Amino acid sequence: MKFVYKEEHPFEKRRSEGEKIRKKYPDRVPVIVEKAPKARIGDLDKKKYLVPSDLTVGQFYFLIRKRIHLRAEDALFFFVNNVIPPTSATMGQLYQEHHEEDFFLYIAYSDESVYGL
């Protein structure tokens, strides 16, 4: 999975901004959120979210769902590193295991339960 954010910002600039934001707001985790390719679903105004780390993935679904506003034909799934994170995982734990080398966590969303479908 590829993110547009990674294509628009060079690695060394992401990494330094990531290190800074983790040291300045350690109770949150920096999360890049983008729509998966081929997803037929609503768009999100912003990509960069600072998220309370003790928030579960299920609760993050709630927060993202609200800002998307799902329609009757919709469903909502999260992908991190080609993997649907368990609704029971905390954002902190998810960050721990899956944050990239720029200290950002990258999450894609879709109306299909397979990334890129």
Partner: peptide, 18 residues
């Protein structure tokens, strides 16, 4: 700041919803 945070109200709801 350049980062988006959810409002107080949104997060408190989420602390309940799941």
């Amino acid at each position: 700041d350049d980062w988006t945070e959810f409002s107080s109200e949104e997060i408190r709801e989420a602390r309940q919803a799941a």
